[PDB]
Amino acid sequence: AAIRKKLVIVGDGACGKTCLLIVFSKDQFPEVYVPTVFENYVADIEVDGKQVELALWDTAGQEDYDRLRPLSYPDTDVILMCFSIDSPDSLENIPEKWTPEVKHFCPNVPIILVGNKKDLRNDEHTRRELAKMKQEPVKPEEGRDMANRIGAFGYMECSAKTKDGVREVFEMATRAALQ
Ligand SMILES: Nc1nc2c(ncn2[C@@H]2O[C@H](COP(=O)(O)OP(=O)(O)O)[C@@H](O)[C@H]2O)c(=O)[nH]1
Ligand SMILES: [Mg+2]
Ligand SMILES: [Mg+2]
Numbered sequence: 001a002a003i004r005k006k007l008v009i010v011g012d013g014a015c016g017k018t019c020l021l022i023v024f025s026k027d028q029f030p031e032v033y034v035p036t037v038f039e040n041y042v043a044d045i046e047v048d049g050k051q052v053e054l055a056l057w058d059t060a061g062q063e064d065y066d067r068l069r070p071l072s073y074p075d076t077d078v079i080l081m082c083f084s085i086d087s088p089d090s091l092e093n094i095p096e097k098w099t100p101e102v103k104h105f106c107p108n109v110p111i112i113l114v115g116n117k118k119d120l121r122n123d124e125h126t127r128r129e130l131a132k133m134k135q136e137p138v139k140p141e142e143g144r145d146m147a148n149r150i151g152a153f154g155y156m157e158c159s160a161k162t163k164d165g166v167r168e169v170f171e172m173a174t175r176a177a178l179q
């Protein structure tokens, strides 16, 4: 009857995974109370005229539990693989940590590469703090290149803070899961 797809979100601690789920889940109508933990959390989305049940799994809190975390991977239909645009170190962990893991436990599962916190790219305090480490915010082309490099289905940027791009992240994930 209903189409259910399992979505798992991964990426470094504090890169915006939980906030991204919260903003998406709060967008749903009728309005529902949204918790701060997501484990098989069912969200109903309509994409291209089709009703889909997305079962959301957040790995926040598990980023350094290398043996516990992969227990969430079986029968995943789509991966949101996140980094934060205010953290080049988070982007470097995409090929170095997250991609090998996800490809191992989720073979042939489509990956959406997601750059979070896009509102920080041109933020004065963010630039100043990063410059102390000889870094700067991630550029869009660096995100697009990484997405090609890891064989992502697509690349999206979003901000949980402004909500820009959030809907589109989940529409893209849903299409990927269906196809
Ligand atoms: N400026 C900005 N801050 C964000 C955004 N998303 C999350 N944050 C903040 O970044 C921190 C980590 O976010 P969280 O979603 O808990 O990250 P998680 O550990 O990956 O689940 C929190 O202080 C959030 O309020 C965003 O889009 N823009
Ligand atoms: Mg990351
Ligand atoms: Mg976010």
Ligand SMILES: [Mg+2]
Residues within 6 Å of the ligand: 035, 037, 038, 039, 040, 041
């Ligand atoms: Mg839940």
